[PDB]
């Protein structure tokens, strides 16, 4: 079971969403700016994507 996507860092947010949904079709994807503070609950269905100001992935996406 793929739960992290280090290969997506530096890709566009669009490509990241597409790839994650191929691997985990039921994923609840939320996009947030990198360098924000977020809640620390663990949701096995969620994948947060942290983007830079260019909308590229700036942190390894993972489930949680």
């Amino acid at each position: 079971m793929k739960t992290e996507w280090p290969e997506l860092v530096g890709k566009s947010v669009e490509e990241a969403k597409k790839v994650i949904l191929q691997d985990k079709p039921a994923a609840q994807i939320i996009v947030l700016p990198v360098g924000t503070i977020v809640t620390m609950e663990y949701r096995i269905d969620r994948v947060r994507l942290f983007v830079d100001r260019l909308d590229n992935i700036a942190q390894v996406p993972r489930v949680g």
Partner: protein
Amino acid sequence: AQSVPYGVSQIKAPALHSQGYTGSNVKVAVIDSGIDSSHPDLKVAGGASMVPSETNPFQDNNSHGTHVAGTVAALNNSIGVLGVAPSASLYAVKVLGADGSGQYSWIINGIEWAIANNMDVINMSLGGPSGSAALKAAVDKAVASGVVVVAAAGNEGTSGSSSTVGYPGKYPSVIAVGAVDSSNQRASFSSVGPELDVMAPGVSIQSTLPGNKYGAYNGTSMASPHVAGAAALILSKHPNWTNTQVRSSLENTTTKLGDSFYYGKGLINVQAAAQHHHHHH
């Protein structure tokens, strides 16, 4: 009928309740997504919002702050759940929007509000992978001012020999809390590192949710408020103990679990913490 979530029992909160101590007159800021003050199993004493587009701290459009608040302080009555410190004075310090995120400056503004309003305990079930000098200064200032500051360790799991504790938990002035389940096993997502201080229940934790609901959540977010609530119990039994002393009492009386890289000092035990003489069980 009220139910006592397993985690409240597991940290030995009922021993304090039977001695007569429930966190009365202790002010605890839940620095989070707000708290639904309409919930019949919560009593919110005050608060403020630092989120520019969501100005009501008593409306929780995410659910997370309400769940965290119920673990700290869900009321002792014939409904719902029971909080660790069910008489605590609970403050909704909203620094996260509906989407679960906040800017560093919003969190800092919430910490400053807590200091200016004489909060005894801050719980931050929140984090990010990087610090900032301004964030470190805000938490250090709160601790210098006498506030017990508790935060989730993070849900980054392991990464070989590297620390994965996030900020503000990773700052020395903040008590970073990892998650165990009802068998005292570390949750696989629980962050690790020499900055991990203590553990508390963080798997399938039943608490209050907005619109008069209840539900089981998972996370170091769920573990942190057991420790913030335990700090309030301790202060209600020892109202002159400093934050230094409350923090040491919790660290010095844990039930040791595994290696400290994965478990810190072990599971908190608020019964033992609230005695005068401290040792591990």
